[PDB]
Amino acid sequence: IVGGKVCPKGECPWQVLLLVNGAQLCGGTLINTIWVVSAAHCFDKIKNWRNLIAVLGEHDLSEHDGDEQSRRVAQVIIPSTYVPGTTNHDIALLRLHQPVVLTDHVVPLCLPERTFSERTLAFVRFSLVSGWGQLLDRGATALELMVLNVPRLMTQDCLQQSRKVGDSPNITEYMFCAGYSDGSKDSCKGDSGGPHATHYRGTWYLTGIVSWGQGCATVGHFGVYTRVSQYIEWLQKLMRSEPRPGVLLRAPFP
Amino acid sequence: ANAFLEELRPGSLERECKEEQCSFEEAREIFKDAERTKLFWISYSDGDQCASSPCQNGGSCKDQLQSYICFCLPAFEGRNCETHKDDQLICVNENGGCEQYCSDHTGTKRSCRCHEGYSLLADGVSCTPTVEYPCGKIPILE
Amino acid sequence: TVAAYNLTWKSTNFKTILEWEPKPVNQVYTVQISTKSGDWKSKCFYTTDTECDLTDEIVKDVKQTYLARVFSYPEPLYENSPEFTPYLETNLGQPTIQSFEQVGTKVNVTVEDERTLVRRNNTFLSLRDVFGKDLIYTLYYWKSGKKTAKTNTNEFLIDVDKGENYCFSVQAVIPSRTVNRKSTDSPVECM
Numbered sequence: 393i394v395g396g397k398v399c400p401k402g403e404c405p406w407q408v409l410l411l412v413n414g415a416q417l418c419g420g421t422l423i424n425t426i427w428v429v430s431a432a433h434c435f436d437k438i439k440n441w442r443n444l445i446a447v448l449g450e451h452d453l454s455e456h457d458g459d460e461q462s463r464r465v466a467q468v469i470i471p472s473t474y475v476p477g478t479t480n481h482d483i484a485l486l487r488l489h490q491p492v493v494l495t496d497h498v499v500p501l502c503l504p505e506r507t508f509s510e511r512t513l514a515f516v517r518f519s520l521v522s523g524w525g526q527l528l529d530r531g532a533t534a535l536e537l538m539v540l541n542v543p544r545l546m547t548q549d550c551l552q553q554s555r556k557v558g559d560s561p562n563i564t565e566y567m568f569c570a571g572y573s574d575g576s577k578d579s580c581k582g583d584s585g586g587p588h589a590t591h592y593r594g595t596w597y598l599t600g601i602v603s604w605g606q607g608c609a610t611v612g613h614f615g616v617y618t619r620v621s622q623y624i625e626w627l628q629k630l631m632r633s634e635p636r637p638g639v640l641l642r643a644p645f646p
Numbered sequence: 647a648n649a650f651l652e653e654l655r656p657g658s659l660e661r662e663c664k665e666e667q668c669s670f671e672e673a674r675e676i677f678k679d680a681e682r683t684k685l686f687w688i689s690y691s692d693g694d695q696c697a698s699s700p701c702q703n704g705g706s707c708k709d710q711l712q713s714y715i716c717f718c719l720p721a722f723e724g725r726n727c728e729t730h731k732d733d734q735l736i737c738v739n740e741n742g743g744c745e746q747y748c749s750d751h752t753g754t755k756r757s758c759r760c761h762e763g764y765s766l767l768a769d770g771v772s773c774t775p776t777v778e779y780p781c782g783k784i785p786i787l788e
Numbered sequence: 789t790v791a792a793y794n795l796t797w798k799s800t801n802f803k804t805i806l807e808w809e810p811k812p813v814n815q816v817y818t819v820q821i822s823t824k825s826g827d828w829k830s831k832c833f834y835t836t837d838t839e840c841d842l843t844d845e846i847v848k849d850v851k852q853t854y855l856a857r858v859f860s861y862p863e864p865l866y867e868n869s870p871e872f873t874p875y876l877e878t879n880l881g882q883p884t885i886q887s888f889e890q891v892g893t894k895v896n897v898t899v900e901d902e903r904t905l906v907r908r909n910n911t912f913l914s915l916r917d918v919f920g921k922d923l924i925y926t927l928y929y930w931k932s933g934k935k936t937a938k939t940n941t942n943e944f945l946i947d948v949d950k951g952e953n954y955c956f957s958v959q960a961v962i963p964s965r966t967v968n969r970k971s972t973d974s975p976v977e978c979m
């Protein structure tokens with residue numbers, strides 16, 4: 393996270409930390425005791441699929457306490473339309489091997505219904521993005537969970553206000569932009585897969601996923617998030633499905 | 647206006663423009679000066695656009711030059727107060743007043759719903775948790 | 789569908805209405821207004837008009853800078869409007885001289901402090917209630933030679949030659965302003 397602040401322990405209870413081979417990998421968003429939503433590009437180069445770990449209740453990667461809960465990732469489901477190395481459909485549904493215990497420091501973020509998210513939530517100017525990602529462009533990651541409030545933009549304004557680059561990726565209907573273009577605040581590489589949580593009338597909902605962008609807080613550029621509203625059905629259908637043998641699962645989309 | 651022989655009489659704005667309708671000439675004869683005549687004739691000839699009684703639902707029209715302004719009653723709005731602020735109970739309008747989910751319905755009024763882990767209170771708009779740790783809530787802040 | 793264009797702000801005494809084009813032919817519109825850091829609020833849902841009264845929204849804080857965008861239907865096609873800061877841009881209506889009483893060799897010309905669309909506690913605030921000191925009225929009168937006079941209230945106390953008669957005209961003016969600093973001249977009145 394760039395230009396943000398530390399999330400007071402417990403105030404980002406749905407934040408997930410993804411570790412591969414004990415090493416830090418990406419962020420995530422818990423939406424129920426059994427499922428975690430993250431980004432698909434986080435698995436572009438995973439070799440040991442049997443070594444993915446999801447930690448909840450995390451906060452300070454430097455000090456352990458009893459709020460921490462670990463779970464092996466039993467399954468990583470990526471849309472069949474996602475293409476490693478690219479940007480479209482940057483989404484992943486992860487099944488934990490054992491359900492996590494809901495506490496004051498571990499709580500899920502609500503997966504909203506499609507229309508409610510497109511018709512209402514998408515019109516809430518601000519939402520929270522967080523993670524243990526880089527505090528600067530090409531910088532080092534954070535030890536304590538960082539959180540940042542970023543304004544949302546409609547693709548049309550995002551484009552009009554973003555200065556074209558050497559054939560960068562298109563901003564599709566499966567993503568949206570949020571953040572600032574002055575070089576002050578934005579999420580970053582190490583935050584990939586983390587939540588873009590939106591507050592609405594007393595409850596927080598999942599509206600996006602830290603996905604991609606031109607560097608981190610680059611002047612004349614915004615952060616790009618996976619438009620989750622576009623996958624609600626995909627996710628629910630899958631969460632009701634039976635577990636598959638291997639870890640990696642490419643499910644058809646739509 | 648000009649009756650017979652009244653023109654022999656000097657000019658008076660009262661008898662000529664207030665008490666009757668006075669053409670531009672009659673006015674020019676009272677004011678003499680071109681600009682003074684034009685500054686008067688602009689408002690004098692504009693014509694009260696509030697005559698149509700454009701403002702609806704008990705509004706109040708305030709005349710302007712070639713236009714009006716409608717001051718509406720609390721429950722109204724729109725150029726002519728034609729908009730019923732009570733006839734907008736659809737989901738796209740402030741989520742239909744619902745706390746979480748909103749569902750429009752042909753003709754009838756919209757219905758509200760809640761996310762798993764919550765329930766709809768008798769007001770048909772709010773939602774309360776039906777589990778200890780409903781999604782979207784931050785424990786240490788509740 | 790064709791995205792709307794030429795979105796223009798029409799505001800007088802805070803009565804604010806956003807207009808646009810073209811003449812809807814198979815397409816309906818929906819307006820959204822907000823403050824730079826506020827949530828987007830919809831208005832004039834699926835209207836077939838090419839206008840939208842945003843008075844009730846902007847009067848909530850005439851000092852805010854609202855942006856508006858018109859959604860077009862047969863993310864949807866839209867067009868953003870120019871920024872609108874009510875207080876700094878709303879046109880001052882045509883003044884109306886309330887009266888003028890003579891007291892010897894002086895005249896008391898009184899300007900009617902018209903009301904605005906700004907609601908406050910179940911009532912419409914006047915132009916003075918809103919602009920306070922930012923508002924002044926200027927008098928352009930003459931011995932029925934041009935004469936002027938400016939006041940920081942809604943009245944003018946001027947000297948006049950006994951016997952001779954006078955005609956009067958006033959204007960609302962917000963000196964600080966850069967845009968629409970004056971209203972049009974009020975109707976001419978003579979004692």
Ligand SMILES: CC[C@@H](C)[C@@H](NS(=O)(=O)Cc1ccccc1)C(=O)N[C@@H](CCC(N)=O)C(=O)NCc1ccc(C(=N)N)cc1
Pocket residue numbers: 433436475476477478479529530560561578579580581582583584602603604605606607608609614615616
């Ligand atoms: C046109 C090149 C982009 C596609 C590329 N831009 S970049 O500048 O190369 C990123 C970058 C920035 C800083 C150090 C290292 C890399 C990009 O973004 N590539 C993807 C992976 C593509 C994959 N499927 O492998 C990526 O890095 N996603 C993580 C991420 C999350 C949030 C932000 C943010 N809020 N801004 C930025 C980046």
Ligand SMILES: *[C@@H]1O[C@H](CO)[C@@H](O)[C@H](O)[C@H]1O
Pocket residue numbers: 695696697698699700712713714
């Ligand atoms: C009353 O008069 C005004 C004059 O502009 C007109 O616009 C209205 O349509 C009419 O009802």
Ligand SMILES: *[C@@H]1O[C@@H](C)[C@@H](O)[C@@H](O)[C@@H]1O
Pocket residue numbers: 704705706707717718719
């Ligand atoms: C004019 O103002 C409107 C708002 C209503 O109060 C009317 O009764 C009044 O005449």
Ligand SMILES: [Ca+2]
Pocket residue numbers: 450451452453454455456457460
């Ligand atoms: Ca820790």
Ligand SMILES: [Ca+2]
Pocket residue numbers: 647648649652661662666
């Ligand atoms: Ca006559």
Ligand SMILES: [Ca+2]
Pocket residue numbers: 647648649652653662672
């Ligand atoms: Ca005559």
Ligand SMILES: [Ca+2]
Pocket residue numbers: 661665666
């Ligand atoms: Ca007569």
Ligand SMILES: [Ca+2]
Pocket residue numbers: 660661665
């Ligand atoms: Ca008379």
Ligand SMILES: [Ca+2]
Pocket residue numbers: 671675
């Ligand atoms: Ca003549």
Ligand SMILES: [Ca+2]
Pocket residue numbers: 653656657672675
């Ligand atoms: Ca005459």
Ligand SMILES: [Ca+2]
Pocket residue numbers: 653671672675
């Ligand atoms: Ca004559």
Ligand SMILES: [Ca+2]
Pocket residue numbers: 692693694695709710711712713
């Ligand atoms: Ca008129």
